Design a protein around this ligand. Structure first.
Ligand SMILES: Nc1ncnc2c1ncn2[C@@H]1O[C@H](COP(=O)(O)OP(=O)(O)O)[C@@H](O)[C@H]1O
Ligand SMILES: Nc1ncnc2c1ncn2[C@@H]1O[C@H](COP(=O)(O)OP(=O)(O)O)[C@@H](O)[C@H]1O
Lengths: 239, 239
């Protein structure tokens, strides 16, 4: 049955690009804590990240972040195949530009003052055709690459140079904005949010199974608490 | 007055094809506990089942199941004639197929994995033009025969072979779906359900008698209890 694909869930870590697995995971694929990992999915697209070792998260499970779930076009309850990729990469020239939807009121240079400080001491990889999201600068902005060195061989380094043209390109309907609300945006409701997972993930992720079995799913859920507790973004995130 | 026909009622046994009678019943028709019985009715159709001996059900009464009440087109308050039929039968080739109304989401082979396991150690008979119902497999599905060996001589055996064509035939309005609610679907309400039998079976089963006598039937029945006790499927089953 090809025991290599595992289900996807939410990661409790607050890091940006960190993938956490269980102890008997890197011992089979002989990968270290700072190796290069390549992930695939639908739409004939690939991905690259950094695998981090952890033995406190769970017993046998792989964590997976939100900034790359929308990037690789992956949703919950899906299978993902992981394999090591010991390929030496080195970025030479990069060219990123933001979308004209979140750059209102920003003028002047914006590449040598935000991007350069956060790239160093991170060595984060990047693949062709990906929309990364960065927090900071009293705002939430993103950038998209359209033309750089041929994939892959993309490694951030202070010696790398950057350039701009001066004409942002509008986004399309294929991607989804990460500025909206997700499971990571809920704080404090752990036990209560854990219940909705085992009541709304079965009928919404597996429709043919429900139109196959005779089980009746719940037809209504009532949330409680005083106003402002977060009854609205929970429903928006689970959607 | 031909003392051979008896009224029909509901059977408390949970078995699929079991007919229970009283002690002075098989002693007149010299039939054993595992003989072959042939039953007739309207529409010039016959039936075949297995008579089971019981001395705890009642004093002088014949039980009769739901899966064959709709099959032989029999309703309550009707007469049924029973006679032994010591005919040796042996099935050779069978060909059953389901109706395209309850096979949504089912693919692959479905004859050597469900039908074969449940047929053995049962020796259940089957007549031509009957819609049997089987419970199990996390669903409620049925099958209908359209072409097999000439009637009767239909006995299930592991040596028998089966085949399929690949085109289900839709059901007609002559038969009724057994997936709906009947008296056997009510659990717990025994004393209360027993009362509705002696108040709604007289005016609905014998209309000419009520338009003959001057008795006024009840014009309204009020059911009680907290929600979910089953006030709705009781009314749907008695209809
Ligand atoms: N438990 C929570 N977790 C994260 N954010 C919250 C929570 N509760 C409130 N908020 C924040 O407060 C803001 C106002 O929430 P509000 O719409 O009043 O919630 P509700 O509609 O349930 O009263 C939201 O933008 C949300 O980000
Ligand atoms: N006494 C009972 N016997 C069998 N099934 C029941 C009974 N009570 C409830 N149910 C089941 O519970 C489900 C919901 O019943 P419901 O429609 O709430 O009854 P009511 O309309 O009387 O409140 C039904 O599908 C029924 O099968």
């Amino acid at each position: 049955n090809r025991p290599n694909r595992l289900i996807v869930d939410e990661a409790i870590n607050e890091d940006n690009s960190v993938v956490s697995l269980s102890q008997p995971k890197m011992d089979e694929l002989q990968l270290f804590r700072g190796d290069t990992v390549l992930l695939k999915g639908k739409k004939r697209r690939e991905a690259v990240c950094i695998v981090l070792s952890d033995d406190t998260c769970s017993d046998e499970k792989i964590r997976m972040n939100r900034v790359v779930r929308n990037n690789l076009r992956v949703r919950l309850g899906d299978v993902i195949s992981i394999q090591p990729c010991p390929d030496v990469k080195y970025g030479k020239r990069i060219h990123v530009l933001p979308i004209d939807d979140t750059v209102e009121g920003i003028t002047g240079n914006l590449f040598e003052v935000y991007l350069k400080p956060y790239f160093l001491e991170a060595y984060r990889p990047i693949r062709k055709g990906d929309i990364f999201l960065v927090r900071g600068g009293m705002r939430a902005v993103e950038f998209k690459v359209v033309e750089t060195d041929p994939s892959p061989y993309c490694i951030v380094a202070p010696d790398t140079v950057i350039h701009c043209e001066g004409e942002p390109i509008k986004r399309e309907d294929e991607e989804e904005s990460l500025n909206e609300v997700g499971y990571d945006d809920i704080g404090g409701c752990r036990k209560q949010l854990a219940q909705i997972k085992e009541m709304v993930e079965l009928p919404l992720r597996h429709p043919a199974l429900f139109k196959a079995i005779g089980v009746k799913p719940p037809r209504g859920i009532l949330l409680y608490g005083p106003p402002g507790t977060g009854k609205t973004l929970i429903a928006r995130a689970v959607a």
